[PDB]
Design a protein around this ligand. Structure first.
Ligand code: NA
Length: 194
């Protein structure tokens, strides 16, 4: 049975580790205190570039966790009966629980959504019940999400290439097919983290 408390918990832990690893050298080195506070009370009116990353990496980690756990059959209501990952299904349960959003927030959730949809790889396992990879001559493959570290690198890149918006509203939907879906957006300048 789906528990959003456990999913979010595991997601945010994974998200924090990726955040602290990707920013360990930067001036804003993703301190745990600020990361958690950004998730407990996210800036939704005029987010800066770091607000955007934290929300993005957190959403991505939660969906990655939900997608993976569903395929592993640990969550009732989703999964199989080798089970292929279904990130789109997970993205829908995410948009149900958490809001759809608007302004920069809404657009960025779509950006993260599209990324996870194109973050599929495949994993193969031996047909034999107890065979290792160096043994079997026949394997069965299913679609699975990339390791989260790779998705995290993509988000870091999108964080680097983010577009700043001027005169944008947090209550208006950014026009569909106006801003590319592979670009994150932010509105506010970042403060001096030193
Ligand atoms: Na499941």
């Amino acid at each position: 049975p789906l528990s959003w408390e456990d999913i979010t918990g595991k997601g945010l832990k994974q998200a924090l580790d990726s955040c602290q690893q990707s920013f360990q050298w930067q001036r804003w080195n993703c301190p745990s205190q600020d990361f958690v506070q950004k998730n407990s009370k996210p800036e939704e009116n005029s987010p800066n570039r770091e607000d955007v990353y934290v929300a993005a990496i957190s959403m991505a980690a939660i969906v990655h966790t939900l997608t993976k756990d569903c395929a592993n059959g640990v969550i009732a209501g989703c999964g199989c009966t080798p089970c292929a990952h279904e990130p789109t299904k997970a993205l829908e349960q995410y948009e149900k629980h958490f809001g759809s959003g608007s302004g920069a927030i809404g657009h960025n959730r779509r950006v993260v959504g599209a990324l996870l949809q194109r973050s599929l790889e495949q994993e193969c396992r031996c047909k034999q019940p107890g065979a290792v990879q160096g043994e079997c001559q026949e394997e069965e493959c299913v679609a699975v999400l990339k390791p989260f570290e790779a998705i995290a690198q993509d988000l870091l890149q999108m964080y680097d290439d983010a577009i700043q918006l001027e005169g944008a509203s947090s209550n208006l939907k950014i026009m569909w097919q106006n801003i590319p879906l592979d670009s994150l957006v932010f509105m506010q300048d970042s403060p001096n983290y030193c």
